[PDB]
Amino acid sequence: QISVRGLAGVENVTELKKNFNRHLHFTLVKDRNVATPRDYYFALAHTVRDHLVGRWIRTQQHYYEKDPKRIYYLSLEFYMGRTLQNTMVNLALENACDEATYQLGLDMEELEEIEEDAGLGNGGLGRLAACFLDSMATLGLAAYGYGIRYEFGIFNQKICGGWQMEEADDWLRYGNPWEKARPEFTLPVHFYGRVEHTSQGAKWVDTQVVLAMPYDTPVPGYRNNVVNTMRLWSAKAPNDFNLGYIQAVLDRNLAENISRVLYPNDNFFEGKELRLKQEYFVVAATLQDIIRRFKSSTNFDAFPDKVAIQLNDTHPSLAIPELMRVLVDLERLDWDKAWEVTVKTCAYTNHTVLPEALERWPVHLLETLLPRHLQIIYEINQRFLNRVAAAFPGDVDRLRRMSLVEEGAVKRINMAHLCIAGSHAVNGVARIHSEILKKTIFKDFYELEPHKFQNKTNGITPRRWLVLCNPGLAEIIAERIGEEYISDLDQLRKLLSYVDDEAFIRDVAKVKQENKLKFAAYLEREYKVHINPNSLFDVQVKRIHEYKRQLLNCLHVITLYNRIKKEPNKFVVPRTVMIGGKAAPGYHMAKMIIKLITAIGDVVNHDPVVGDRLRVIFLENYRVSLAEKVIPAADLSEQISTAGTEASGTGNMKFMLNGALTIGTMDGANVEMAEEAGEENFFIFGMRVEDVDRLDQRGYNAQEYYDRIPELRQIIEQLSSGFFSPKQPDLFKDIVNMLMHHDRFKVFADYEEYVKCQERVSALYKNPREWTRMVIRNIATSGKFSSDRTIAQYAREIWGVEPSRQRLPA
Amino acid sequence: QISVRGLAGVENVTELKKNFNRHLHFTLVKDRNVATPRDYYFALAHTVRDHLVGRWIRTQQHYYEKDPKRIYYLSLEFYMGRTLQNTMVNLALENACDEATYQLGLDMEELEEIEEDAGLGNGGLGRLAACFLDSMATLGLAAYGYGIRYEFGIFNQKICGGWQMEEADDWLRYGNPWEKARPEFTLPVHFYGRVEHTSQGAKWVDTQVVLAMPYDTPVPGYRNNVVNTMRLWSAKAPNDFNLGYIQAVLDRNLAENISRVLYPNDNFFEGKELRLKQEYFVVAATLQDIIRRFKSSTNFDAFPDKVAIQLNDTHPSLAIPELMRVLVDLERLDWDKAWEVTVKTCAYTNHTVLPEALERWPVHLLETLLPRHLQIIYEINQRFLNRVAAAFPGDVDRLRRMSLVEEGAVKRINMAHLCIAGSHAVNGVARIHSEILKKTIFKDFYELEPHKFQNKTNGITPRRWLVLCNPGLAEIIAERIGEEYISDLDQLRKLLSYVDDEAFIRDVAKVKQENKLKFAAYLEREYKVHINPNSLFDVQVKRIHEYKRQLLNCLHVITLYNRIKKEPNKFVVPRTVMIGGKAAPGYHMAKMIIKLITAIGDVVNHDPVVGDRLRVIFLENYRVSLAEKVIPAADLSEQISTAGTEASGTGNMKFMLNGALTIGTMDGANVEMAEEAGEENFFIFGMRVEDVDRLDQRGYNAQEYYDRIPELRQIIEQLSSGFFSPKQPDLFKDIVNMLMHHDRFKVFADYEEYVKCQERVSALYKNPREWTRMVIRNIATSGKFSSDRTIAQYAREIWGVEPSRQRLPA
Ligand SMILES: OC[C@H]1O[C@@H](NC(=S)N/N=C/c2cccc(O)c2)[C@H](O)[C@@H](O)[C@@H]1O
Numbered sequence A, B: 001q002i003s004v005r006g007l008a009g010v011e012n013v014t015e016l017k018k019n020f021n022r023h024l025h026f027t028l029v030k031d032r033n034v035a036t037p038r039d040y041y042f043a044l045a046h047t048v049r050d051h052l053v054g055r056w057i058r059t060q061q062h063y064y065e066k067d068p069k070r071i072y073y074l075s076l077e078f079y080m081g082r083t084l085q086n087t088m089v090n091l092a093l094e095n096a097c098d099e100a101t102y103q104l105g106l107d108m109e110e111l112e113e114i115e116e117d118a119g120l121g122n123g124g125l126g127r128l129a130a131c132f133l134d135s136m137a138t139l140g141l142a143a144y145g146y147g148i149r150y151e152f153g154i155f156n157q158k159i160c161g162g163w164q165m166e167e168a169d170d171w172l173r174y175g176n177p178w179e180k181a182r183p184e185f186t187l188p189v190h191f192y193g194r195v196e197h198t199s200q201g202a203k204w205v206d207t208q209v210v211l212a213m214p215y216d217t218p219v220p221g222y223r224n225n226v227v228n229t230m231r232l233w234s235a236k237a238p239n240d241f242n243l244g245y246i247q248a249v250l251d252r253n254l255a256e257n258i259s260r261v262l263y264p265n266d267n268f269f270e271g272k273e274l275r276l277k278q279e280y281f282v283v284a285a286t287l288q289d290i291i292r293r294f295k296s297s298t299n300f301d302a303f304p305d306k307v308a309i310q311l312n313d314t315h316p317s318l319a320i321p322e323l324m325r326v327l328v329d330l331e332r333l334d335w336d337k338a339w340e341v342t343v344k345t346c347a348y349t350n351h352t353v354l355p356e357a358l359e360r361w362p363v364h365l366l367e368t369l370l371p372r373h374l375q376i377i378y379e380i381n382q383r384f385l386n387r388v389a390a391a392f393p394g395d396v397d398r399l400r401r402m403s404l405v406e407e408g409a410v411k412r413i414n415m416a417h418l419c420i421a422g423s424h425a426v427n428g429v430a431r432i433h434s435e436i437l438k439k440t441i442f443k444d445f446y447e448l449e450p451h452k453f454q455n456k457t458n459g460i461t462p463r464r465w466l467v468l469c470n471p472g473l474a475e476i477i478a479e480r481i482g483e484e485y486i487s488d489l490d491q492l493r494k495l496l497s498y499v500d501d502e503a504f505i506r507d508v509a510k511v512k513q514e515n516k517l518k519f520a521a522y523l524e525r526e527y528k529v530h531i532n533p534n535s536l537f538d539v540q541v542k543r544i545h546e547y548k549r550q551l552l553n554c555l556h557v558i559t560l561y562n563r564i565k566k567e568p569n570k571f572v573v574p575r576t577v578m579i580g581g582k583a584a585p586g587y588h589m590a591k592m593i594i595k596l597i598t599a600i601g602d603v604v605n606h607d608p609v610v611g612d613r614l615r616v617i618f619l620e621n622y623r624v625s626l627a628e629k630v631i632p633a634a635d636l637s638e639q640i641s642t643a644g645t646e647a648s649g650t651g652n653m654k655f656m657l658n659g660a661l662t663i664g665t666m667d668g669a670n671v672e673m674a675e676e677a678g679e680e681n682f683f684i685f686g687m688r689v690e691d692v693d694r695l696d697q698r699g700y701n702a703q704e705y706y707d708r709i710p711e712l713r714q715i716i717e718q719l720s721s722g723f724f725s726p727k728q729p730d731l732f733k734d735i736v737n738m739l740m741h742h743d744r745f746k747v748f749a750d751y752e753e754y755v756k757c758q759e760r761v762s763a764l765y766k767n768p769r770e771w772t773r774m775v776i777r778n779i780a781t782s783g784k785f786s787s788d789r790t791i792a793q794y795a796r797e798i799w800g801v802e803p804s805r806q807r808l809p810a
C-alpha cells in the first residue's frame, strides 16, 4: 500500500505464501483448523528468518576472506525490542509479507503483537547498544555485539492500587526463533582459586569452572545485504559439577544463575557478587572468542590493527586486566608490550556523572573471586601513579585523587579510573557531557593525557525510530524528497523548502492526527481508558528517577488543575498528560513518584468540573514496543532533567524525529538539538549548568521558593494535608520532606520558568498552522541525531576504519 | 544393500539429498566448509522428522473423528534410547537415507552415534514402557504415553580406579529435534494449602501453583502410517512466583526442580518429598488433559467406555484419589458413582515383590503436601475395610493386614493396597510372578476379589530388538520366511524346519561371528581393550543388585581362573566374560560389587599363564544404545537371579531373539522361555522357588557350604586375604561378611549347580554345529515374547479394545 514498505511482486507473494504454509505444517505441526494465533506468528517469523540465511553466511565468509579490522562492542545490555518488523523493513519485505498474509486471511499487525520484546536492557544505555548494532551493519562494518543472554530481562510492570508491582519477564518461554545456538564455541570461564608463582611467572590455579555457551542473533543492515552477529553468552555447569547425588544435580543451578537475570538498576551501583560474576563472565568468554578469531587469520603487535574493543560504560572494564592476564600469563609477552597492545585496543564510553552510579568494587570481593586480576590491577595502578608523579612532582593530593585504589572504611577499586588508564580514547555522549568530564570529574586525567578525551554525541536509528514506527510520516517525506534519507538522514534538511508548502503542512498535521487516533484506540482496547484525541498529547516517558524530574511535571499538572478549579469557565487548551516508565525495585522514592502520578490521576480524571480538558494517565510497562506506539502520537516531548545530570538522553531525539515539539532544559543533547533547530523552534526554560553551580555555592534553600510563590505553597499544602490521599493523609510525607529539605535536583528552582514556558506551549498549540510549521523545522534538522552519524565518527576517530554504504551481492 | 532396510528408489534418494541440504543451510545455518559432524546429524534428523508430520497430524485427526476408547499409559519412566534409526526403520526409510548420505560423502552409522540416548528410565520398568509404546502404535491403538520430561536422565557412569563415578546426563544440552513444545496446553498443578468445608462440599484452598508445560514426541508404528504421542510434562514457575527482587527470580528454581532429575533407584523406595511432588505433578497434569479430551467429545457414566488408565507400578497411584477429587469436589458427583467410574477406569501393573521397593508414604508428608488427597485416601480405606469386615466377619488380623494405612513408629500409606482397591485389574508381568502375587504378598486381596487378578507376561519389541540392532540376522531370516514376522513374531516357528538346513546353520553362525567382530572392534576403538573374538562371549548386563547375583558370576570367574592356575597346560574353552550395569548412587554393596569385578579383571587379564583363555571386562555406562551393540554379539546370556526375585526380566528375551543361549534359574520369564524352547535347549540350574522356601524354613547357613566345598573355601580365603587387592588387604571384608552371615539371596546355595551347568555350556560350545542348532531352536520359539503379543492381551483382557494391523492412508 505505501511505497517505503517495498515492492509486493507476484513471484514474491506466491513464494512467501508457500513457505508460510510449509512452516506451519512441517515446523509447527499444525493445519489451519487447530492453528493458534501464536502458531501463525511463528510461521511468519520462520518464513522471514529464512531470508536472512544466505546473506548471514556470505557476510561472515566475506570477513573471513577479506580480514578487515573487527569491532567488538561489549555491553551488559542490549535493549533490542521486537525483531520481526525490523527484519522485514531492512530486507524490503514488509509490503510482500503484508500482501501474502492478507491473502491467507491474516492481519500481519495482529501477528506482530504476539512477539515478546527482547528486553535485555534498562533504558538509554541498552537501547544505544541496539541502535549502534543497526548502524554498524548499515555502514558495512565488521562489527560484533557481545553480551549475556539473560533468561529474564527487565521485569514486566503492573500497576496495582496505584503501586508498581514487578513480574518476571520469561521472554524465552515459547522459544526464540531469532537465535541460533553455537555449541561448538562453548568456552570455560574461571572463578575463585588462588595465584601460584613459578619460575615461569604467575599461574591461576584451583579455580571453579563455568561454561559459556554462545547464541547468535542476526543483525541485518538496511538493504545492503549485510548481516552481522550479536553473540550472547549463556552460563552452563560442567557435567562433573559437584560430582548426595540428587542435591549435586540440583546445585547446578548455582553456576547457571550467572545468566539468569538482568540487574534492573538504571544509573545506580549495587556492589553484589552475582553482578561482578556477570561482568567477568561476559569479558572472559568474549576475549577468548576474539583471540581465537585473531589467530585464525604469534605476533601480537598486529593485534590492535585487527581488533577494537569498545567498553559500554565500566560494566565490562575487566576486559583490561583480563587482556593483560592472557597476554602476560598465557602468551608470555613482557608487561610493557602487553600494556601497549591493551591501550591501543580498548576504548571507553562514559554514560553518567552521578556519583552513586560509578562502579567502585570492594577489594575483598575481587580478592576472593578474581585474585589474579586484583594483582594485575595493583600493578597497573603503581605504574600509572609513577607517571603522574613524574608529570606533577610533589602533587601528593593528585596522586590520591587519581589512584585506581580508593582508601577508606573498605578499600575499593574505581573502575572508571581503570578504564581511562587502560584505554586510548575516552568519550562522553553529548558535547556538554564531554566538557563536564574534562572540567570536573576526570579533570586530573584530562590534564595528564588530553589527547584521550573525545566527544561522540548519541544518535538513534532512523530505521526503527521512523520507518518502522511511523510509516505515514516516512511516506509523506519520501513523496517529496525520495527514499535516500533513510540511510542519509542529513537529507531531511531538504524539507526546509517545504515549510511554506500548504500541501505538506496539511499532510504533516494529518499524519500526527492519525497516529493520535490510533494510540487513543490502543488505550481503550487494551486498558479501557477514555481520552480526547483533540487534546495536546503531553508525554514524559523514560525510567523514573529523581534527576529526570517527573516530579516537576507533577507540579505543573497540579497547577493546571488548581487554575481550572479557580476559574472553571475560562478557556484552556485541553491536554492529555501521559507519564510512563519503570522504577528500580529497590528505589523507594521512585516508587512513591509513580504512586503520586496515579493519585493525581484519580482526582483529576474524575472531577466533573474539569471534564475532558485535563487527563492524567500513567503508561504501564513502558518498553521498546510501547515507545514505538506512543512516540509517533506525541505533540510535546518533556525533557526536563536538572541541567548537568542527563548525559545525553536519546528519547529526546526519537520525539524530535516524529513530529513532537520539545520542552526542555539546556541539558545533554537538548543543547545540540536546540542548536540544530534554532532556539526559536524549541521551548527552553530553566537554570543552565552555570546557574546550578551558582546556587550550590550559595546553598539551595527550597523554603525561599515556597515562601515567595503562592501557587507552589498551595500544592505543597494539598500534598501534605491529604488532598490527593484522603484515607491515608500522610502518604506523601516523604515526598514533601525531600522537596523541602533534601532535594539534590532543585525542583522548586525551575518551577516558575517551567510553568511560564508551558503557557507559551499552549499558546502556540492554539494556532495549528504555526505549530505544524515549527514541527517541520524540527524534523528537517533532526539529521545530526542519526546513529549512522554517531557510528561513522566512532569508526573514523576511535576505531580507525572507514564506513561503506556499498551493497554486498545477493 | 539389505532387503529388510527398505527400497532406495531414485526419486526418494534425490528428495532426501535436497531436503538434507536445505536443512543444513536454512535450519543449521552452515555450508559444507564449516559444518561439524553434529551439524550433519541434525540435518539428517530434521530430514527424517519431516516425514513424520503428515502421518502424525492425520493419526490424531482420525482419533478426533472416530472417537475410539483412549488408552493412557502413566509412567515415571520411559527409557527410549535413540530415535533416529528407529524412526527410519518404522518408516521404511533406512536404505534410502543410507544411499542419500553416502552420495553426499557421509557415513550414516557415524552420524547415528552422535544422538544422545533419551535415558529417562532406570532399567526394565522404563524400557518396558518404551517397547509398549512401539507395540501400541504398531497395533493401531489410540494410545498416549504420559510422563515427565526430566532435564537430567539416568547418570552417565564413568569407572575411575575401578570405582563407579556419576556424571550428570545433560541430554538436552544441544536441543532435542524429536520433541514439540505445546504451550497452549500448559496447565496448573496445586501443592500444599488446606481443606475448607462449605455447605457445598470440600474446597482445597491457599495452594502453591506450579505450571505443567507439555512436550510431544512422536511414536511411529511399524509401516502402518500410525504416529501416536508421548506427552512429557516440564515444570515451570508462574510469573508472579515469589513476587528482594533478584532473589525472588532466582528462587523460581525451587518450583522448576520438580522436573529436573530422574531418581536413579531401581527396585528401592526412597521416601523423599521431591519424589512425591514428581508423582503428583505427572498425575495432576495428565488427568486434566484426559478430562479435557473427554469433554471435547457432563455424563461421566461413559467415562470408562472412552478412557483406560494404566498405572506402571504404584508410582502414579495418586491418579486414583486425584480422579476421585476431581469427580467429587469439582464435578459434584456422589461418592459411590465417582468410585464406580474410578475403578472401571484404572488398572495396575506390579513389577516387584521385594519389600524394600514397595512404596509406603509417611502420612505426615501427604498431610502437608496433599491434604485433600489424604482425606480421600482415609475415606477409601474406611469403605474398603467395611467390605472386608462383611466378607470375613471377626477376622481382625485380616483387617489390619489389608488396611491402606499402616500403623507403627510413623503411620504410612501402602500405595500397592490403594492401587488394588481402586483398580478393576491387577497384573503381574510373568506367570510365576502373578502366581506369587496371589499366593503370598496380595493373598488377602485375591481372596476378597479373585476376578481382579491377571497375568500379562512381558515382551520386547522386535523392531528395536531385532531389525534395528541386528539387521544381519533379520535378513537371513527374511530370506527364508519373508518379512511378515517383524509384526507377527510367532511366524519365527517356521524356522524349526531349517534346524537341519546346512546353509541356514552356516548363515546363523556367520552373522554371530560378524557381530562379535564388530563388537570386538568397538571395544578397541572406544576403550583400547583387546579381546579374542573366537572366545565364547559370556555376558551379564542389567542394573547391579544383590538379587541379580552378579556375585555368583564373580565366583564362577574366580573358579575358572583357579582351575587354570592349578592345571595351566590343560585345554579349556576360551571365554570373554562381560559384566555391565549401573549401581544406584547410594547403594554401597552394589558399588563394592563393581569394584570386585574390576579387581578380578586386574588380576586375570594380566596373568601370563592365563593368556587369552580368560578375559574379564566391565562394560562401562550400560544403557539402551550399548545394549543394541552387545546383545547381538553375545553367545551366553546370564539370567541367574535367586528363584522368586526377578518378576520377569526382559533382557533375557532380547538375548533369546538375537542368538545367544541362556544359563538361568527358573525365575520370572525364564520359566516361560524354557517352556517355549524346551528345557533341553536351555541351561537351567539351581533352586526352584519351592527349594528356596524349604531353605528359609530351616534357616540358611552359608557356613555349611563353605565347609563342604573346597573350591568355594579357596575363593573366600583369597577374597579375605587380599589376593584381589594387595595394597588394601581388607577392601572386600564387607562382601565376605555379607556372603557368610547375612546373604538374603543364597549365593552359596546355587554355586555347585551353577559351576556344573557352566561346564555343560563349555562342552556344547566345543561342537559349533550343535551349539548353532540349539540357537536356532531358541530363535524359532522366541515369538511369544514380542510386546505385540503382550499388548494385544492388555487390549483384549484389560482395556476392552481390539487391536488392528490395518494401514492408515499415506
Ligand atoms: O526454534 C526455536 C529454537 O531455534 C533454534 N534455531 C535454529 S535450530 N535455527 N535457527 C536458524 C536461524 C536462521 C536464520 C536466522 C535466525 O535468526 C535463526 C535455536 O538454536 C534455539 O535456541 C531456539 O530455541
Ligand SMILES: OC[C@H]1O[C@@H](NC(=S)N/N=C/c2cccc(O)c2)[C@H](O)[C@@H](O)[C@@H]1O
Binding pocket: A026, A027, A028, A029, B049, B050, B052, B053, B175, B176, B177, B178, B179, B180, B181, B217, B218
Ligand atoms: O529444534 C530444537 C527444538 O525443536 C522444537 N521443535 C519444533 S519448532 N518443531 N518440531 C517439529 C517436529 C515435527 C515432526 C516430528 C517431531 O518430532 C518434531 C521443540 O519445540 C524444542 O523444544 C526443541 O528445542
Ligand SMILES: OC[C@H]1O[C@@H](NC(=S)N/N=C\c2cccc(O)c2)[C@H](O)[C@@H](O)[C@@H]1O
Binding pocket: A122, A123, A124, A125, A126, A128, A265, A266, A267, A268, A269, A270, A313, A351, A352, A356, A357, A358, A359, A429, A458, A646, A647, A648, A649, A650, A668
Ligand atoms: O548514552 C546512553 C544513555 O545512557 C544513560 N545511562 C544509563 S541508562 N546507565 N548508566 C549507567 C549505569 C547503569 C547501570 C549500573 C550503573 O552502575 C551505571 C544516560 O543516563 C543517558 O543520558 C544516555 O542518553
Ligand SMILES: OC[C@H]1O[C@@H](NC(=S)N/N=C\c2cccc(O)c2)[C@H](O)[C@@H](O)[C@@H]1O
Binding pocket: B122, B123, B124, B125, B126, B128, B265, B266, B267, B268, B269, B270, B313, B351, B352, B356, B357, B358, B359, B429, B458, B646, B647, B648, B649, B650, B668
Ligand atoms: O516388568 C518390567 C521389569 O520391571 C522391573 N522393576 C523395576 S526396574 N523397578 N521396579 C520397581 C521400583 C522402581 C523404582 C522405585 C521403586 O520403589 C520401585 C523388574 O525388576 C523386572 O523383573 C521386570 O522385567
